[PDB]
Design a protein around this ligand. Structure first.
Ligand SMILES: CC(C)S[C@@H]1O[C@H](CO)[C@H](O)[C@H](O)[C@H]1O
Length: 335
């Protein structure tokens, strides 16, 4: 009786959702997912720590038993899958960078290990995962060259980023390959992301897209987001995914006032925020091809634990699967 997000935005972009694997065995979760969403991302289940294993000998192997369930579900329900994520400083075991003695691998050995990892994971889902977050959160504006000094940088060096895209494109030449990041509309970081992607495109690196995480709060300036999309879309041939959208009801990551239940005025402010945001996304529909929310409904949000245990209401559906004020405001950005 309520409209379907994916149908409302059919001519604009895929409408996606980040999901933990438990939802596939929950009839009420499956009802809400299959009504509204034509794209899905594994919230954790396709990250390196979720796939990498070592046997009693210390030999690396791959466990796809959980990740496989996403492709099985997507195929059953006619959904596309964003693969998240191949190369990241987070949720990647420190032992992946080391030999049996706990010493750092050589650059040569770690390039080979990255190649095997990306070939194995992207190869397994070739033609079934239409888009990959190949590299996640590689930018640090505090560094002289703008690049985060992670183990990837320390063990391979600054070409690890372009190599990851090379290897992913080898494993699945039809996949759309994304560089994904947060705080992507803050000016200094925006300019580093722009320069990184533009320079990789100019030297023929197979990068097809920029993933804008859009982990927002009610304190964020939506004008800055419009300006960031305007800057990124000047890179010829690049498309944009909104990969991890949510809107915290708080105005910082460390609020001193925490809500038990959200004031109605806060939910209305959130509806106004989401409306202005979707007006900007529709304005840039020529470059945005997927808008994915980082969770199905408010009580599943990472924002209830990542910055400290607290209630937050960051999404379009409440704890009882009901549309929020923001659901209607988002729908009204079209209607
Ligand atoms: C899917 C999310 C966990 S990505 C998220 O972006 C955050 C910024 O708000 C932090 O940078 C976290 O490191 C990162 O995991």
């Amino acid at each position: 009786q309520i409209p379907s997000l994916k149908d409302v935005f059919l001519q604009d972009f895929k409408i996606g959702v980040a999901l933990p694997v438990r939802v596939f065995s929950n009839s009420m979760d499956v009802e809400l997912i299959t009504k509204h969403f034509n794209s899905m991302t594994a919230e954790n289940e396709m990250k390196p720590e979720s796939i990498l294993r070592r046997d009693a000998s210390g030999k690396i192997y791959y466990d796809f038993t959980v990740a496989d369930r996403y492709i099985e579900f997507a195929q059953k329900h006619g959904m596309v899958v964003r693969g998240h994520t191949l190369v990241w400083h987070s949720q990647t075991p420190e032992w992946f960078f080391k030999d049996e003695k706990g010493n750092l691998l050589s650059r040569e050995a770690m390039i080979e290990r990255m190649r095997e990892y990306i070939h194995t994971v992207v190869g397994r889902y070739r033609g079934k995962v239409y888009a990959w977050d190949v590299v996640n959160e590689a930018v640090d504006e505090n560094q002289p060259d703008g690049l985060r000094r992670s183990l990837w940088y320390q063990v391979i060096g600054p070409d690890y980023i372009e190599l990851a895209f090379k290897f992913a494109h080898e494993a699945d030449p039809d996949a759309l390959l994304f560089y994904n990041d947060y705080n992507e509309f803050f000016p200094k970081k925006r300019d580093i992301i722009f320069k990184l992607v533009k320079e990789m495109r100019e030297k023929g690196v197979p990068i097809h897209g920029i993933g804008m995480q859009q982990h927002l709060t009610l304190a964020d300036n939506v004008g800055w987001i419009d300006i960031a999309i305007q800057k990124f879309k000047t890179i010829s041939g690049i498309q944009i995914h909104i990969t991890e959208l949510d809107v915290s009801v708080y105005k910082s990551r460390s609020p001193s006032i925490i809500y038990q239940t959200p004031p109605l005025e806060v939910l209305k402010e959130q509806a106004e925020f989401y409306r202005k945001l979707f007006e900007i996304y529709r304005k840039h529909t020529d470059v945005i091809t997927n808008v994915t929310f980082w969770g199905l409904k408010d009580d599943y949000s990472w924002l209830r634990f990542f910055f400290g245990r607290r209630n937050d209401w960051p999404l379009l559906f409440d704890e009882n699967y009901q549309p929020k004020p923001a659901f209607w405001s988002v729908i009204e950005s079209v209607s």
